[PDB]
């Protein structure tokens, strides 16, 4: 989707800096992260049912650019986008698919880092 929205409030916070410089950075370096770097390409991957099932696509490249563009008002909003990305993967793919295991390992790290996020100040 959009990396900026003229009608949506956005700002800088120390927590959003943490999302950018700790959470995004830590997940990007993981070997399981590459399926999430860019929007799902239903044509290249021949997934003619992907956009029939997933209505609100999300990916880590979009989250990263949103952080750089001050799209978010709060860290919780950026966390919600991470959640949309992982939840889409669980909703669409087969329960036994490799990508589901990849999503699970990344989401565990996501939640661990969120648990350590500095208090908003």
């Amino acid at each position: 989707p959009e990396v900026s929205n003229p009608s949506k409030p956005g700002r800088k916070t120390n927590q959003l800096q943490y999302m950018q410089n700790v959470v995004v950075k830590t997940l990007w370096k993981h070997q399981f992260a590459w399926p999430f770097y860019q929007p799902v390409d239903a044509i290249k991957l021949n997934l003619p049912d992907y956009h029939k099932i997933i209505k609100n696509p999300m990916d880590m490249g979009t989250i990263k650019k949103r952080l750089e563009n001050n799209y978010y008002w709060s860290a919780s909003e950026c966390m919600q986008d991470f959640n949309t990305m992982f939840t889409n993967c669980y909703i669409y793919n087969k329960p036994t698919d490799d990508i589901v295991l990849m999503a699970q390992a990344l989401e565990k790290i996501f939640l661990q880092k969120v648990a350590q996020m500095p208090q908003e100040e």
Partner: peptide, 9 residues
């Protein structure tokens, strides 16, 4: 559902 195939995990 079609799904994305193996990713060598």
């Amino acid at each position: 559902v079609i799904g994305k195939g193996g990713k060598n995990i």
